[PDB]
Structures are given as structure tokens and as C-alpha cells.
Design a protein around this nucleic acid. Structure first.
Lengths: 57, 122, 117, 117, 206
RNA sequence: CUCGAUGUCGGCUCGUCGCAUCCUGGGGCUGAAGAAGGUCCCAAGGGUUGGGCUGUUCGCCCAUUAAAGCGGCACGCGAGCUGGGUUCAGAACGUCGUGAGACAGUUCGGUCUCUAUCCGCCACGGGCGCAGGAGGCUUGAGGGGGGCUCUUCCUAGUACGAGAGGACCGGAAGGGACGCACCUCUGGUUUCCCAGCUGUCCCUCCAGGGGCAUAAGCUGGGUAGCCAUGUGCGGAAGGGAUAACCGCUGAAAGCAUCUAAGCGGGAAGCCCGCCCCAAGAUGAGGCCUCCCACGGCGUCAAGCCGGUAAGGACCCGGGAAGACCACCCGGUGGAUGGGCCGGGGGUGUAAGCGCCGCGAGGCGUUGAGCCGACCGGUCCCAAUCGUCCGAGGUCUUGACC
RNA sequence: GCGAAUGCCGGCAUGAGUAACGAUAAAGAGGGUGAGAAUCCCUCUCGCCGUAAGCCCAAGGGUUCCUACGCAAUGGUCGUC
RNA sequence: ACCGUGAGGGAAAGGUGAAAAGAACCCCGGGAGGGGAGUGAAAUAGAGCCUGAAACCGUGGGCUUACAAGCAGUCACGGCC
């Protein structure tokens, strides 16, 4: 039923996908060891802040 | 508590303790044959003899079901729906009446005679 | 319909209760379990109270919790094996903790939560 | 604090013990008198005997639609603390269960079993 | 003719008879935070606050915009035009007394995003012969070459929950002179336990 | 124009200008006593019910009412329903036609598709800017919202009067339909909150439970939140200018006239005063507070780096704010969530043992047992720990120290 | 010796990263294997059938059935199935 | 091949290099596929791998842009480079 008309072309696909845009992951140093991690989760190394209970097997 | 097209008892000379009211008399925009109000209508039920017939009058609202919140927050709901037939002057048409006390009615006031008339364990 | 909302739940009530239970159980089995973010939030609320009767203790508390998870083995393992240890503490008998990782194809952020030692 | 707090307070202030009545009883068809009055401040120990149906619950409460048979059935709902009332004396029974709203009575009683409860 | 506050709930109260109900309003201490004196801000007025939320946390600038005539630990602040300040701190108590007439208002509870159904009245279309959009939905948006299109500013679905508004006139009913509390009998103009205030106009006949 | 196509009735749903104004007021007029009528000019502000039968818009009838107006936009509305209608084959009669088949004469049924691109509307954010860099309080040009109306009573039964009947003027009370909030009251829901119940498979036989009997199997009730049928409120005054219509002072018409002169009166109407938007009004920002001028290279260096947490951002925990989003308060020197705890309102005396009863159950301990959002304590659990970005402050003219 | 014929054949964009994943009979946990497993393997919770989604004969299909490896393709993604 | 019940319908796909010398071995990887080394006259001649242009999609540089309503453009001029 409602097919547009044609496309402001580039103009469009652009302006749109544009305001879209894509970002990366917010991160900080390990609450113990190396690398970094997100605002609150252990990881496959410094598996903690108080009792890793996690990292390697 | 209210209605337009309605089926409700009466009890006065009533050729049929029931009729059907078109609408509430009050300000053009009825929408609720309100308690202690007054309305327009015809009879629906049968009158042996009577004199009442199968016509239509003007009448006042008694009982109702769903919210009698008196001003002082006194409250009751009738498990029946009726009025007294008035004969236009307002002044009522009949001898007696089946229903009890409870101001809302008298608060309307004008019909004291009603007031006196129906008043007991029935 | 919706606004001021208390107790956040998904699926359908029968399912929900179904989960709350099953997981409540599996965990009671392993101390610590792995699932998705809220799976945990809520499983926390529920297993929380559940262990609370576990400890609560007696023929009644017991009878209730079984009414719930239907199995002595655990019933007891719980009610008398750990429940006590906690029993003196103060609610929140559990730890819900997020991991750095998502389930497949989706990215479902998950974590682990366990009897709180 | 808040709500609970302050409000609880004010009401306390005017509502005061609703004349320590504490005569709730079941649905006793019991009998009372409200100042209910009009015309020449003709306030009358008005007394309706009625089979009590339920109630409203916090500062403001209500000794519910005690249903009574007059000409037909007519039910009377009273605002508790409300100075409106003076006399509230018990006649009938605070007997039989299932919790009010058991208009079962008015519904289709037959005073027979109606009584039978 | 101004009081600043956080309100509680609407609840019933009795009177000479019957009762009806008011709403619980509380205004700790409205205090002269800044004055816009005309030479200063023409719309001369009293800008105040009325309480105090945790001191640890406290922006600098604030610390001092306050400092000015220094007050304390709150964050509840706003202001009103043409309201002299017969004080360097006012209360509510006496500020306002019952048997007085009041106007009042504040935030508007946050509904949601509902069409004709909600938004406005005339609860949409119908139901029995038409179920291809069942019971109701949205009316008609305009016309062919009438204006040649869709209108420009008639009611519409959506956000009609998070907004601000007011209760024209209502009653003072009563004052509990201690914990600056008022029973007003008014339209609980917005959530309870929230941002609310009092102002009072009425130079008109009855 | 339109046919490589513009979906025509009627009806919904949502309407939006017009006035030749129905109701509303202001009006000069009367064959105006009062009253109520009828007659024109001004004024569209708001208002401009329910049924009945008919596919009918029309219309006639029922009952009201202040009134229950005419009409503009393809007789507005199918990319928004509906589709009775008329306008596909049937079969129907009446009617024609030698009949084929026909009749805008009837009659019975007869497949409205629609995953928005533009402009347009309603809302919600990411920009980038209203040349220091900042958190919070504002005043609005001007934009939007509501401006209705009835009945009772006092002055009054006096003004009028033959009498029956009833005025300006002005003042009270109540209601109608409508708009704005909001739960206390009343009330509706409450998908799990409480209670009874049948059948059935499992637990472990008993009782004492569990799923399934929809996405709760069936019932009887149930906060809080959302919500009327429930509750507060509104439609104001009041100020200024005007319409019709009335006068004032006054000539030109050496008397006279509201008249070009200059003055006043004057409608629910117009501007304002009522609420709610808003300087992306780059033609404000006004005010309060507070951070202070780093480093390294061709300069009107308004370019590249760490810089102040002055601030704020991120992420975390929450929020009747909420599709996202932004909005909003908190993040462990804190009650934020959930847990627990007490407390309101829930179900309606539990699970067990005790007691009378062949028994069915009854009664007692139990007005207990279990309790989701409601008021509030309490770090028991989980708000750790950390990251980033974010002034140095243009040129020119005048003013003061 | 060619825009142009809603032309012809073959590329290629556009909606659009919205519509949509084939039934409202539900999942969840634990261990396991793996380069990687919401989406394979074992195992413990729970729902739906059951007179059918159950067995069987015949029809039509015709590879496949198994065992070992393997997934780049194919399953409307995933995937060591 | 494929569509159709049968009759019948009835495509696409040619060109790596002079000749295989066409890819040892080392380097990321589950692989693929990507970096080196040797082929070689070239490999931007590398297995569909001659010549391989138009559409459309990408990465980088100059100019350009948030008080703006114009199919286009385009005549003038100034600021950039």
C-alpha cells in the first residue's frame, strides 16, 4: 500500500543513519589485577573485590 | 441510582407499582433519574380498575440502589427502585405509601405529606 | 492501566512462580547459581524469603517451605543444614552479582547469585 | 515519618477514639442511633437495627450497610468515628464466618436458613 | 499571600457536622533565599526554599548563592512575584490561618501516553458491528482540498502524564501551627508526598 | 483538468470557518401600561438534549429545553471504522418483450487491502548556537487553554393595578451539561493477596501440599496503584478602548442638530486581568553564587595538549517520570533498592494436639494462620572500586577606578 | 548510431537495518564437549499431548538408516546439531 | 538444468599464463583467509585469476554548513585553497 516516492537519496539514508551513530563500552581499571572492566562485575582474572571465586580452570 | 428509559416501582394509587420514565425533569440534560429527584413517564405495569390507567405523569424519586450519601455522610442504598407519582402540581396522587423514613426525601421536603404518609417497618 | 508499579515480573504468573521455584531450588542445591540480570534480582527476593522460613524453623516453617519446593532431601538439607548458619543474621541471605558477559546471539547480560556467605 | 506519621496524628486529633465503641462484632444485626437529624435541629437517637455488612478502614471507617428489611430491603452504611453517631448498642450476633459482603442475606435470604447462617 | 511546600495525602475531616476532606500540606520553613527587588529584578519577589537534604552532598556555588544571606541545608527552592517579605524567614503557621480562602498548586501526577481513548474525552469509536479497531480508536484528521491536508493543533495521543498545573480556588480549612501543616480540603493538585505550594487571589463577586 | 483513473449516499469517530444570530446580550420601535409578545440595526462568545419509524440526510410523533439555528470544506472526512444503501452473476414477483432479456418498480443474500517516503499533526530526545567557564531562581513580547446557562427566594407583591398580573435596579441560594485536578468518602478492578470447591496424576497411605483443569480450573471477598458512578475547583471580578443605540457643549444651515470641533454614555463582544507554554524571540537572556587566567609551536595563534570536579558526564541503585530518551533522587562518610522488622488493610481462625460425636463433623487453643504495591526503623544483602570531558577567557568604540 | 516504448537482458540502489522468523504447549538450573555452544551431550527442577502430537499396515519418497569423521554451504541467524 | 499432468516449455556459463613454472616454508587463525619468501618480464596476469569501463558502497584530502524556504541552474562579485 504505501511506497514512499524515491529517497532524498544520500541526503536521507545519511541524515538518518547519521543521527543514528554508534559508540564504544564505558570502562575502568581492574578492582584488582590488570586490564579493565565495567562498573560492577568480576572477570576471568581479578575475579573480585572481595573473594574472586572466578578466573581459570 | 439513576436512568433514562426506566422501570421502577411506586406504590401510590399506582395502577402498577411500575412504569418507565423517559427522563429526569431537571435542567435539559437529564442523564440520571436521580434519587430524591423527579421525572417524566408512562406506566409499564397493569392496574386492575384503579383510575390510574396506562398513561403517564410526572413523579418524585424514592429509593434507588447505589449511593445515598446524605450531606452529613449518613448513608444507605435501597435494594428497590421507585418513586411516588406526583400529579403535575407536584402534590401527590394516592392515599398511602410503602417505604420508610430517611431525610434525603424530606430534604427535598415538598411532599411532606409523603413524609407523614409512608413511614414504617414497611 | 499502568503507573506506580510494585514487584517487577515477566513471562506469565504460572511460569514465573514456576521459575522462582525451580531456580530457588537448584540454587539451594549449589549455593551459587548463574542466570540473567533480573532472573537474579527476583530470584533474590523469593529465595530470600524462602530461606527466611528455612531458618524460621519448626514443623510449621518446614511444612510451608515444602508446600513450596516439594522435596525433603533439600527441604531439610536447607532448613537444618545452612538455614541455621544464617539464622541470626538479618534477611538478605543472598548475594546477587553481575558478571562481565552476555549470553549468545543476544548479549543478555548475566551474573551469579548465591547463598550469602 | 511522613504520611503515617503526621496524618495519623491530625486525625487522631479530631476523630479521637470513635467513642471507644470497639463493638464491631461480625455482622450482628445490632441497633443504633445517629444524631441524624434535620428540621429544627431535630436530631434523633435514630436507631436502625441491621445485619452489619463490612466496613471502611483507617481514621475514617464505616460500620457497614447493616441490611434491614422495611418495606423491602434497605441497607444502612455508617461513617464510624463520625460524630454523626451517638448510640451504637449491640443486639444480635457477631456469629458465623466468611467475611462480610455476604449480602447473601439481602441477596436471596429466606429468613429461614437466612437465619440458619 | 504565599506558602511553600511538600504535601502529604488528602484525607477526610469532620466539621460542624458531616465532614468532607482536605489534604495534608507541610511547609517547614520558607526562608528569604534571594529577593528580586525591582532595581534588581523588576518582577520583585521573594525566592525561597523550605527544608534540607543531606549536607555531605552540596554544590559549591549553591553553598554560596546561599551564603549571600546564608540559610542552611535544603534544595527545595523557587519563588513568587509581588510578595513582600516581612521577615528574613517565614513559616506557614499564622502565615496562613484557616477560615481563610486559598488558591494552590504544583506538579501534575504522571499519567502516560494515551490516545483519544485517554488524552481527552469522547472515548473514541464503537463496538459490535465494527471490530476492525474494536470498541474505539482515533477519529478523523482533516480533508482533501479543504485545507488540502491534515490540520495543525487538535488533541493528540502521547505524553500527558509528566506535567505541571494548578488548583484555582479552594479552602484553608485548618492549620496545625506546629509542624507547619495544613488541611485544605482541596483537589490534592498533584501527587502526594511531593512538590506543592499556596498562593491566594480572589478580588471577585459571588 | 481528471478516465494508465478523483471510492458518489447514509452513519459513525474528530471537526473547522460563516452569519443573512436559534438560544445568549446591546439595542431604537409598537398597534409598548405590566407582563409577555411582534418589528428592524449591532454583536458569533458560549451554548445549540433523549427516543420512536424509516439504509433516508428530510421528515412526522414522544418528552423535555435557554434553545433545542441555516450553512461553508468534492454536499469534510476508506490510505480512520462502518457500508443498510445504490452500483456484479442468482432467484423472486409485479411489468415488457413473439423471446432472448429487460424495468432508476420492488424483493431475499452479495470477498473496504492497506509492513507510512515527503509536506502535515502530537509528543520525546541527540545537535549547535543566544563569543569567559559554570549551578540554581526568574520576567515575559507573545503563543495556547476557559469564556454557557436554568430555577428558587429578599427588597416586592410595592413600580403597573380595575382585576386576573406581574419590572426595571440590585442582592442571595441551589442545579444542569461542560473543563481542570484528585482518592479521604462512595465506589470498579486487583492474574496471585487471602478464603471455600469438584475432578485428577504425583508427594510418601492419612490427613497435610503440588501442577493441570486459559495465558488463574470454579466461586467470595480484597488494599495499594490505574480509575467513575465518587471528591475539591472553575466558567469572576474587575480595568481600558468600541458595535447598534443615547446624550453633551456648537457653529457652517445671524433660532434649530450629537457634529467636521472637542466631551461623555454605552453589549456575555475586543485588549488586559484567570490559568499553562516560551528567548533557537541567536533581537534579553535578568538576577543570585562560584572557578580562576596552564603549558608548547609564523598572530587579528577565536589552532593543536594536561589542566579546576568550579561543574558536570559516564556506570551503578532506585524512582506513580517513564516505548527508547531525556526528567528525578540516591550510590555505602549513605537508607537507594531488596531482605528483615514493627506498624496500617487484607483474608477469616491456620498446621497440630486436645475435647462430644457410630459417623459425617463439631468444638477448644485461634477472632488465630498467611499475608504483593501502604507508614515507617534497620547497612543483613547489593549501591565497591573508577573513567572522561569540561574557563582562560575576540576585535572596537565610550564610561568610570 | 538512440533518455525514451509501465519495453528487452543483466547488474544496482530504495524503503530498512523498521515489517517479519511459520502457530501463545513455558521454561530453568548443573555438569559436559568444544576454537565458540540461549540454540549439541548427560543429568536434576517444571508445562503440553494421550486419543492424541500415540503405536501399525498400506500409499506415495526414494534417499536415506547406522558408524566415522566435516560445516565454508543449508536451516527463515546462531551451531563444534 | 529447471517449470509443467501429459502435450509441451525450454536458459545460463566461452577467454588465469609464453609454457605450470600455479604456489614449499616461516608468520595470525577453528578455518578461511590475511603477512612474508620463491615463480616472474607483469601478478593491481593470481584460479574464475585477460582486457575488466557505467550503477551503487567504502577509506583518506580541499572547499563547504545550523536565523533558513531553491528541480535546477546559473550572470556578477567577494572569501578560501
Amino acid at each position: 500500500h504505501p511506497v514512499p516516492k524515491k529517497k532524498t537519496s544520500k541526503a536521507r539514508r545519511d541524515a538518518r543513519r547519521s543521527h543514528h551513530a554508534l559508540t564504544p563500552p564505558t570502562l575502568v581499571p581492574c578492582p584488582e589485577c590488570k586490564a579493565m572492566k565495567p562498573p560492577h562485575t568480576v572477570c576471568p582474572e581479578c575475579g573480585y573485590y572481595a573473594g574472586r571465586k572466578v578466573l581459570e580452570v | 441510582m439513576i436512568q433514562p428509559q426506566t422501570y421502577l416501582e411506586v406504590a401510590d394509587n399506582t395502577g402498577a407499582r411500575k412504569i418507565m420514565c423517559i427522563r429526569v425533569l431537571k435542567g435539559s440534560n437529564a442523564k440520571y433519574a436521580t434519587v430524591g429527584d423527579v421525572i417524566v413517564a408512562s406506566v409499564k405495569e397493569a392496574i386492575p380498575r384503579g383510575a390510574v390507567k396506562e398513561g403517564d405523569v410526572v413523579k418524585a424519586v424514592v429509593v434507588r440502589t447505589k449511593k445515598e450519601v446524605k450531606r452529613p455522610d449518613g448513608s444507605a442504598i435501597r435494594f428497590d427502585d421507585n418513586a411516588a407519582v406526583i400529579i403535575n402540581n407536584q402534590l401527590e396522587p394516592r392515599g398511602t405509601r410503602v417505604f420508610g423514613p430517611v431525610a434525603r426525601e424530606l430534604r427535598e421536603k415538598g411532599f411532606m405529606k409523603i413524609v407523614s404518609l409512608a413511614p414504617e417497618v414497611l | 492501566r499502568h503507573l506506580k508499579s510494585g514487584r517487577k515480573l515477566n513471562r506469565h504468573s504460572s511460569h514465573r512462580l514456576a521459575l522462582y521455584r525451580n531456580q530457588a531450588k537448584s540454587l539451594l542445591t549449589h549455593g551459587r547459581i548463574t542466570t540473567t540480570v533480573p532472573k537474579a534480582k527476583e530470584l533474590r527476593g523469593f529465595v530470600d524469603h524462602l530461606i527466611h522460613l528455612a531458618k524460621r524453623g519448626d514443623l510449621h516453617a518446614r511444612r510451608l517451605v515444602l508446600r513450596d519446593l516439594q522435596d525433603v532431601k533439600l527441604v531439610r538439607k536447607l532448613f537444618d543444614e545452612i538455614a541455621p548458619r544464617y539464622r541470626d543474621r538479618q534477611g538478605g541471605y543472598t548475594r546477587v552479582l553481575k558478571l562481565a558477559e552476555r549470553r549468545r546471539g543476544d548479549g543478555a547480560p548475566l551474573a551469579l547469585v548465591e547463598l550469602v556467605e | 515519618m511522613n504520611r503515617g506519621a503526621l496524618i495519623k496524628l491530625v486525625e487522631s486529633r479530631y476523630v479521637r477514639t470513635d467513642l471507644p465503641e470497639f463493638r464491631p462484632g461480625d455482622t450482628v444485626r445490632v441497633s443504633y442511633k445517629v444524631k441524624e437529624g434535620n428540621r429544627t435541629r431535630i436530631q434523633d437517637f435514630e436507631g436502625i437495627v441491621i445485619r452489619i455488612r463490612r466496613n471502611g478502614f483507617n481514621t475514617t471507617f464505616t460500620v457497614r450497610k447493616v441490611s434491614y428489611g422495611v418495606g423491602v430491603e434497605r441497607i444502612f452504611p455508617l461513617h464510624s468515628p463520625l460524630i454523626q453517631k451517638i448510640d451504637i448498642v449491640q443486639r444480635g450476633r457477631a456469629r458465623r464466618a466468611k467475611l462480610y459482603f455476604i449480602r447473601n442475606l439481602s441477596d436471596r435470604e429466606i429468613r429461614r436458613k437466612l437465619r440458619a447462617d | 499571600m504565599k506558602g511553600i511546600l511538600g504535601v502529604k495525602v488528602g484525607m477526610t475531616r469532620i466539621f460542624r457536622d458531616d465532614r468532607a476532606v482536605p489534604v495534608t500540606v507541610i511547609l517547614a520553613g520558607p526562608c528569604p533565599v534571594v529577593q528580586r527587588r525591582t532595581p534588581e529584578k523588576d518582577g520583585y519577589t521573594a525566592v525561597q526554599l523550605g527544608f534540607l537534604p543531606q549536607n555531605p552532598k552540596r554544590v559549591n556555588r549553591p553553598l554560596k548563592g546561599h551564603f549571600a544571606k546564608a540559610g542552611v541545608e535544603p534544595v527545595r527552592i523557587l519563588r513568587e512575584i509581588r510578595d513582600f517579605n516581612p521577615e528574613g524567614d517565614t513559616v506557614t503557621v499564622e502565615i496562613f490561618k484557616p477560615g481563610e480562602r486559598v488558591d494552590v498548586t504544583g506538579t501534575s501526577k504522571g499519567r502516560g501516553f494515551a490516545g483519544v481513548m485517554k488524552r481527552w474525552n469522547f472515548a473514541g469509536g464503537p463496538d459490535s458491528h465494527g471490530a476492525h479497531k474494536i470498541h474505539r480508536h482515533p477519529g478523523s484528521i482533516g480533508n482533501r482540498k479543504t485545507p488540502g491536508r491534515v490540520y495543525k493543533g487538535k488533541k493528540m495521543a502521547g505524553h500527558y502524564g509528566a506535567e505541571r498545573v494548578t488548583v484555582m480556588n479552594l479552602e484553608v480549612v485548618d492549620v496545625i501551627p506546629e509542624e507547619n501543616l495544613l488541611l485544605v480540603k482541596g483537589a490534592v493538585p498533584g501527587p502526594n508526598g511531593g512538590l506543592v505550594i499556596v498562593r491566594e487571589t480572589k478580588k471577585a463577586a459571588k
